[PDB]
Write a structure and sequence with these properties.
This is part of a larger assembly, with chains A (480 residues), B (183 residues), C (24 residues), D (257 residues) and E (95 residues). Chain A is 61% helix and 2% strand. Chain A is mainly alpha-helical and 480 residues long. The radius of gyration of chain A is 30 Å and the shape is elongated. Chain A starts with a helix and ends in a 6-residue tail after the last helix. The termini of chain C are far apart. By secondary structure, chain E is mainly alpha-helical. Chain E is built from 5 helices and no strands. The chains are: A mainly alpha (480), B mainly alpha (183), C mainly alpha (24), D mainly alpha (257), E mainly alpha (95). Chains in contact: A-B, A-C, A-D, B-D, D-E. Chain D: Keywords: Isopeptide bond, Phosphoprotein, Proteasome, Ubl conjugation. Chain D: Belongs to the proteasome subunit S14 family. Chain D: One of its GO terms (biological process) is proteasome-mediated ubiquitin-dependent protein catabolic process.
Chain lengths: 480, 183, 24, 257, 95
């Protein structure tokens, strides 16, 4: 008891400092950044806010409860106040409440007091200049609080932050005018709590009412604030719309646009994983392997944790349907390994041309196939076994009888033996010629050609268009 | 895919189809894309009294598909039921496209200067002075003289300078704004 | 990051090759 | 109240007149409740379920008359019914196979994309039971096998069920696409195995294709001559576009400059 | 005219001959100087691949660059002479 009682005081001071000065220096600094320059945007505290939010998402967040200085909620949410020279007095009032909190119990517990608190900014009337400061002062307690998952009486409080964000959405439909240099930070912050829309709604069932609401927000941002807005909202669309049918494959067709410019960073890569599974549902394997590889290869630096391992998991699925895959056991991480353990023997069965080896993988690992969600291609891969199996033996064997190859091709009668190779040439597999009497399959090859034209002529536009973009970057980054 | 109802002959299934459209189209905004060619069956049929609203929903799917001038063409063929209802935001876009195309059509006809001028539909110029009633009723001279400079025509502009109250001397420095941006 | 997506969730052969001789 | 509605469901229809009469009574249902947007009080959606049954048999009648716009209309109604914002509905016997049997015709006509996106709704409903999925996918593997043989044996055993004129066009789109996926280009083969290509005994389809193919008609044999074919060189035909390639590329070089 | 008289040097002798003399040689022994140019490819670019690693050691630019820039781009401009003047063969040989 004395140890646990005296170890309570040490923890709070760290949130009492960094959690106090995180939105004070970044948010209060963004106030001066939003007064001037305006360049145009930047607003580097918006990306610094991303660093602080992602910092809280690990440790320590805020609430929950923690029983440490719950008076931080009324601190920033009250006392604009009101015009800038009067706000300076309230900038001293934060220090006044620092002394009040340094004297008495400092209101270490709020809970049901969030009802007057969250409505106090509406009692001030008003900030009135910066809506992102009002939305952030209310959300910063509540957004990390969603990670508690208590599911009692505070879920509707998260919904109240969603209503405050809807007031942020109506103001996202009006002012402008003109260059709402704060709406990019509103795109950032709202995309977060739009994913908190996803989490809080997923506590019970699908959000479908918010699918029409997301389409209302996604379409009302057109065309003005779509920049960096439409990208995050399209992932908010694509993610759960990939979980719930339907039509998103043809919906993103008419939705594009592209939509440029890609922001922010890994956002477009993960979008190419989301739409990567989409474009993989059309089964064209050149665009699917390029969108899946570009999804993972374009994503630094992690941690955390396993979904960046999931894009790598589903990445080589289209490579399994290509007919040739390397053994990936050397790419296993300490985490991704234990997650894909069935998928290991799966791609090992894809390398081999044995049917029973692949079918036993299906019967045993079908439970993990339910966990991943990819099924339909597991039964049709038997056609990849007959095409890779015939690619194997044909190129392999000098002249193979249709009765001897019939074991690995499982039928290979005297009739279909013609089509196996012939319709493989239709798919561009093997050139083997067969004169059918008994018969026997005599595989030869003569090709000397290509390896030339498209690679070098494309490399011209590749390199040139690249260095042109690198011009568009460097030439435009010299403002300082 | 509610557009499949249009294959049946009698128009009452079409009015019930668009009654399905105007509500749940939020998720179906992209669904009508491939079937717009089937919407053309209603848009090109004169004996169909609801072809107007058929051009409304066709202008909505074209609004989601990114088509602007095409949505303006169907806005002209959307009759009276189009201009009467404005909610959400369908307005600022189509009136931006309408005013833009209108003022550049007026500039096109102003260089002729006279004769051979292209035909101007009464509805696209109808929502010009009708939506300008917002500028006349709200008593905003800055925007009123703004659109008055856009139309490039002396008649409706003569009505803007004829609006009530004052504007005692405001035409003077308004011409300073004109000559500043004058081409 | 931690932002965005990720926080959501013939043998060798020895014996057989030596046996091929004495098989036939 | 209202009806008589499902009285013709057990007897089906002797001709298309009763199908059009059912379309008329269903039109009266469309005159009152229509398809939407009545949430309810799902008691008003009870006759929507009673409509789903006759719309399922309406799709069986639509394929019975072979008319494509009919089927895809009632299939879109069944889709939007299961796609409606309220998913919970009384379970219907055809609710499962209407996805899979249409999927059977969908993939067995050689569509490799729409199979994945048809079952991409959610995997759970497809995994549980009543699986018709195994036949079409292996059938497609027997399309490039090709078959013919194992498909004709699979033409004797079909799930099926109640969908016929779909598999009729499915067979037609199989026959012509075999002649499209064979040559060019394949090498020399013998006669009696081209009798094994199209099977039957000596059908007139072997004369229709041996003409269409062309290719070659040899005695007791067939050839790919001549040769393999047309012998692309390509000589200097690509050299002109090779010149043009750097024509506008040196133009891009001057754009830097 | 006296301007074009000395321009005969860098343009062509007759404005026809000298670059029809470039149609005389025309890659002919002109690949020998392409072999020496591709020897300048191997020579200069084998020490050009040593440059960016050293840039990572010294951190970074010694000002520099070695230049060791452009060069064989001009050889590719002679490749524009290759593609153009050889595309004239289709006009020369046929009618």
């Amino acid at each position: 008891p004395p140890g646990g009682g005296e170890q309570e005081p040490p923890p709070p001071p760290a949130p009492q400092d960094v959690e106090m000065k995180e939105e004070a220096a970044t948010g209060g600094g963004s106030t001066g950044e939003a007064d001037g320059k305006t360049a145009a945007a930047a607003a580097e505290h918006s990306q610094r806010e991303l660093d602080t939010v992602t910092l809280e998402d690990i440790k320590e967040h805020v609430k929950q409860l923690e029983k440490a200085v719950s008076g931080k909620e009324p601190r920033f949410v009250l006392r604009a106040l009101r015009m800038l020279p009067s706000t300076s007095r309230r900038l001293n009032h934060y220090v006044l409440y620092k002394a009040v909190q340094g004297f008495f119990t400092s209101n270490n517990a709020t809970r049901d007091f969030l009802l007057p608190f969250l409505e106090e900014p509406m009692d001030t009337e008003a900030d009135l200049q910066f809506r992102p400061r009002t939305g952030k002062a209310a959300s910063t307690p509540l957004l990390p609080e969603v990670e508690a998952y208590l599911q009692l009486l505070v879920v509707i409080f998260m919904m109240n932050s969603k209503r405050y964000k809807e007031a942020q959405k109506i103001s996202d439909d009006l002012m402008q005018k003109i260059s709402t240099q704060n709406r990019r930070a509103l795109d950032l912050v709202a995309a977060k709590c739009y994913y908190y829309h996803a989490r809080v709604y997923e506590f019970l069932d699908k959000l479908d009412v918010v699918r029409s609401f997301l389409h209302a927000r996604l379409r009302t941002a057109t065309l003005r604030h779509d920049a960096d807005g439409q990208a995050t909202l399209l992932n908010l669309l694509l993610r759960n719309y990939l979980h719930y049918s339907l039509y998103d494959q043809a919906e993103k067709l008419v939705s594009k646009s592209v939509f440029p410019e890609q922001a922010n960073n890994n956002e477009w890569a993960r979008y190419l994983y989301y739409t990567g599974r989409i474009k993989a549902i059309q089964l064209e394997y050149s665009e699917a392997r390029r969108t899946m590889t570009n999804a993972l290869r374009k994503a630094p630096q992690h941690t955390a944790v396993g979904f960046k391992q999931t894009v790598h998991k589903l990445l080589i699925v289209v490579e399994l349907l290509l007919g040739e895959i390397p053994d990936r056991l050397q790419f296993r991480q300490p985490s991704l390994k234990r997650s894909l353990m069935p998928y290991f023997l799966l791609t090992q069965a894809v390398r081999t041309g044995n049917l029973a080896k692949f079918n036993q993988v299906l019967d045993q690992f079908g439970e993990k196939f339910q966990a991943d969600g990819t099924y339909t291609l597991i039964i049709r891969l038997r056609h990849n076994v007959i095409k890779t199996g015939v690619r194997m033996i044909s190129l392999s064997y000098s002249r193979i009888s249709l009765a001897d190859i019939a074991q690995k091709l499982q039928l290979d009668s005297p009739e279909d033996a013609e089509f196996i190779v012939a319709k493989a040439i239709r798919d561009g597999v093997i050139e083997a010629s067969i004169n059918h009497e008994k018969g026997y399959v005599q595989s030869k090859e003569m090709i000397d050609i290509y390896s030339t034209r498209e690679p070098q002529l494309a490399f011209h536009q590749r390199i040139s268009f690249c260095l042109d973009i690198h011009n568009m970057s460097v030439k435009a980054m010299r403002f300082p | 895919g509610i557009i499949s109802l249009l294959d049946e002959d009698e128009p009452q299934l079409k009015e019930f189809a668009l009654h399905k459209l105007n509500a749940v189209v939020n998720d179906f905004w992209a669904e009508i894309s491939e079937s717009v060619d089937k919407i053309e069956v209603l848009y090109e049929d004169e004996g169909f009294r609801s072809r107007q609203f058929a051009a409304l929903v066709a202008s909505k799917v074209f609004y989601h598909l990114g088509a602007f001038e095409e949505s303006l063409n169907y806005a002209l063929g959307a009759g009276d039921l189009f201009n009467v209802n404005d909610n959400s935001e369908y307005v600022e876009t189509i009136i931006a496209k309408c005013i833009d195309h209108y003022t550049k059509q007026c500039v096109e006809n102003a260089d002729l200067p006279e004769g051979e001028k292209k035909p101007i539909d009464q509805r696209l110029e109808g929502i010009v002075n009708k939506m300008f009633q917002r500028c006349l009723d709200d008593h905003k001279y800055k925007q009123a003289i703004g659109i008055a400079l856009e139309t490039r025509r002396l008649d409706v502009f003569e009505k803007t300078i004829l609006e009530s109250n004052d504007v005692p001397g405001m035409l003077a420095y308004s011409l300073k704004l004109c000559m500043s941006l004058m081409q | 990051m931690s932002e965005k997506k990720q926080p959501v969730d013939l043998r060798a052969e020895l014996e057989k090759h030596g046996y091929k001789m004495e098989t036939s | 109240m209202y009806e008589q509605l499902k009285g013709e469901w057990n007897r089906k229809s002797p001709n298309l007149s009763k199908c059009g009469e059912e379309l008329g009574r269903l039109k009266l249902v469309l005159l009152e409740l229509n398809f939407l947007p009545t949430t309810g009080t799902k008691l008003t959606k009870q006759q929507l379920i009673l409509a789903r049954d006759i719309l399922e048999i309406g799709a069986q009648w639509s394929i019975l008359r072979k008319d494509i716009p009919s089927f895809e209309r009632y299939m879109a109604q069944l889709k939007c019914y299961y796609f409606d914002y309220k998913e919970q509905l009384p379970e219907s016997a055809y609710m499962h196979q209407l996805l899979g049997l249409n999927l059977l015709f969908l993939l067995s006509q050689n569509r490799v994309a729409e199979f994945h996106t048809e079952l991409e709704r959610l995997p759970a409903k497809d995994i549980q039971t009543n699986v018709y999925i195994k036949h079409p996918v292996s059938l497609e593997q027997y399309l490039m096998e090709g078959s013919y043989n194992k498909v004709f044996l699979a033409k004797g055993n079909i799930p099926a069920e109640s969908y016929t004129f779909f598999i009729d066009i499915l067979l037609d789109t199989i026959r012509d696409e075999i002649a499209g996926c064979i040559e060019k280009a394949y090498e020399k083969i013998l006669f009696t195995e081209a009798t094994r290509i199209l099977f039957f005994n000596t059908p007139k389809k072997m004369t229709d294709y041996a003409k269409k193919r062309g290719w070659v008609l040899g005695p007791n044999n067939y050839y790919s001559f001549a040769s393999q074919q047309q012998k692309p060189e390509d000589t200097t035909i690509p050299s002109t576009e090779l010149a043009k390639q750097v024509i506008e590329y040196a133009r891009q070089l001057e754009m830097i400059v | 005219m006296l301007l074009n008289l000395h321009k005969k040097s860098w343009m062509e002798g007759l404005t026809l001959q000298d670059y029809s003399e470039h149609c005389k040689h025309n890659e002919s022994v002109v690949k020998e100087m392409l072999e020496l140019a591709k020897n300048y490819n191997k020579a200069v670019e084998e020490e050009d691949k040593m440059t960016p690693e050293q840039l990572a050691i010294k951190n970074v630019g010694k000002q520099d660059p070695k230049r060791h820039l452009e060069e064989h781009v001009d050889v590719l401009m002679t490749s524009n002479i290759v593609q153009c003047l050889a595309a004239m063969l289709d006009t020369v040989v046929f009618k």
